[PDB]
């Protein structure tokens with residue numbers, strides 16, 4: 001029993017973190033086989049960051065302008081290329097700690113673990129969701145750029161995020177591992193705004209199912225609702241519309257608890273309309289939306 | 305910027321997790337140099353668990369009654385001993401992945417990371433505090449026994465917890481790595497109750513300092529209070545008394561924000577008396593008490 005924000009074990013990713021230096025700028029890189037992946041703004045100065053032309057800045061660099069450190073051992077760069085917003089540095093040594101891995105680009109509402117690093121050295125691990133507005137509410141200080149997000153599936157590491165920048169609101173924006181930003185953002189030091197966020201409805205429902213699995217039932221009721229009437233309420237409270245694909249994803253948890261999805265929607269609706277009234281759910285005084293249906297199944301038991 | 309429940313990177317501990325089997329009972333073990341550490345109730349049957357005599361049960365066992373698996377490779381047990389509530393199994397192979405490490409017994413209110421494992425295989429990582437009543441609010445399923453809690457300091461792994469059991473309330477109890485339980489608990493399948501818990505005052509204050517560091521100020525006020533008048537309020541709301549050692553621990557955060565400790569106590573008092581009134585602090589609708597002063601400094605920047 002119990003329910004915690006749980007990250008994947010980070011060891012397979014720890015053995016891939018390196019430090020990349022170009023001029024005075026240092027950030028983190030990801031070392032897989034013989035290629036090091038990092039944000040391309042490592043090739044920028046403070047002046048270049050205002051409005052950079054990266055093709056221009058990179059053509060002015062050679063392999064020896066880049067310093068790669070793995071532990072204390074320095075790696076030799078034998079080639080370099082740019083792919084979207086990530087820099088690829090070919091090195092002379094294949095990383096012997098390279099896990100089985102894939103690059104995947106995730107959908108808003110999916111979760112992943114972040115291994116926050118500074119100067120190539122892992123400092124901590126936490127759980128994140130990709131918000132509907134394509135930012136993440138991370139914990140990142142200067143020098144965290146190049147930290148990656150990932151999921152693990154049977155010793156295959158699926159990398160899905162690389163950290164690039166913090167926006168004026170304090171939230172964070174980055175790319176997939178092929179350098180494509182999540183959301184409309186671009187890698188220049190201009191003030192960019194995220195669109196207004198919404199609550200990840202399917203995740204709030206998964207977490208309500210987690211609460212039932214752990215014996216929390218005070219919020220349930222006998223009422224049920226329709227998909228359409230619930231979505232009217234969702235709109236009113238800035239919740240993502242609930243799709244039928246989302247109803248179907250919640251199937252396993254619905255069956256394991258006996259509570260039909262649209263039955264749980266009536267409880268959420270009532271929770272949205274009446275608040276918690278001082279009570280808590282799984283130790284929280286607000287509705288949590290950074291657990292997917294998959295996260296709940298993985299962490300919870302197969303029996304209530 | 306940002307503030308997350310952050311665990312230590314788990315890789316150094318991942319390379320130490322093994323599976324220990326005795327009869328039909330399997331749980332997790334910790335493999336350091338040539339010794340495997342695990343809960344002693346691995347030598348129990350379902351019948352033995354009601355009221356075991358462990359010296360009796362262990363004298364009836366030989367080395368070959370214990371199966372140790374590291375990955376798929378089986379380890380050979382060449383000796384065994386009991387120390388308090390942990391079993392020590394000597395094996396023929398020193399763990400080549402043994403980190404620099406120490407065993408430490410922590411105080412209530414301190415935090416640590418848990419690497420939850422099943423059948424010797426790590427499944428996830430999360431942050432925990434030792435509650436004042438010497439339980440932890442973990443996330444543990446059957447088979448998690450032997451999972452360990454740890455802190456990391458400059459590549460030294462300080463192990464401080466081994467998981468043994470879940471109590472009727474759903475919270476969890478375990479030992480230090482020398483087998484001494486935290487709290488009054490014993491390792492038999494009787495219904496034991498934890499004492500009533502209290503809120504970790506010094507940690508709530510550290511977290512309020514975290515909020516200021518991240519630009520959250522709506523809860524501050526101009527009032528200050530005395531240590532004695534605050535402790536009257538603490539008692540009323542089931543908060544640990546605040547000691548002078550605790551005031552002094554909060555020194556660095558006080559200086560970095562300019563807010564004196566007893567100044568922050570007046571804000572906490574007002575928060576305790578008036579509630580949040582719908583607002584949140586670092587994304588939470590209640591006062592968080594599982595971040596130590598040290599956790600806040602480690603995760604936050606040196607400048608507000």
Ligand SMILES: C#CCCCNC(=O)C[C@H](Cc1ccc(F)cc1)NC(=O)[C@@H](Cc1ccc(Cl)cc1Cl)NC(=O)[C@H](N)Cc1ccccc1C#N
Pocket residue numbers: 041049140141142143144145164165166167168169170171172186187188189190191192305518519
């Ligand atoms: C609550 C709350 C808000 C608190 C105040 N928040 C900030 O002051 C962060 C601040 C906000 C901001 C945004 C646009 C601006 F015009 C001016 C300022 N963001 C940065 O200064 C950007 C500027 C930048 C560099 C490079 C590129 Cl490609 C894009 C961008 Cl936007 N620096 C970084 O993101 C570092 N790579 C990494 C870094 C540095 C410093 C602090 C954190 C990080 C991280 N992580």
Ligand SMILES: C#CCCCNC(=O)C[C@H](Cc1ccc(F)cc1)NC(=O)[C@@H](Cc1ccc(Cl)cc1Cl)NC(=O)[C@H](N)Cc1ccccc1C#N
Pocket residue numbers: 001214215345353444445446447448449468469470471472473474475476490491492493494495496
């Ligand atoms: C909300 C809420 C509460 C929900 C209901 N909670 C439970 O049903 C857990 C249940 C509560 C309980 C306590 C005392 C009893 F008399 C009877 C039952 N606890 C267990 O069944 C103990 C019994 C036990 C075994 C060995 C020793 Cl040494 C001591 C103890 Cl007490 N089993 C374990 O702790 C496994 N080692 C590991 C394990 C098994 C199953 C589930 C979780 C775990 C873990 N982690």
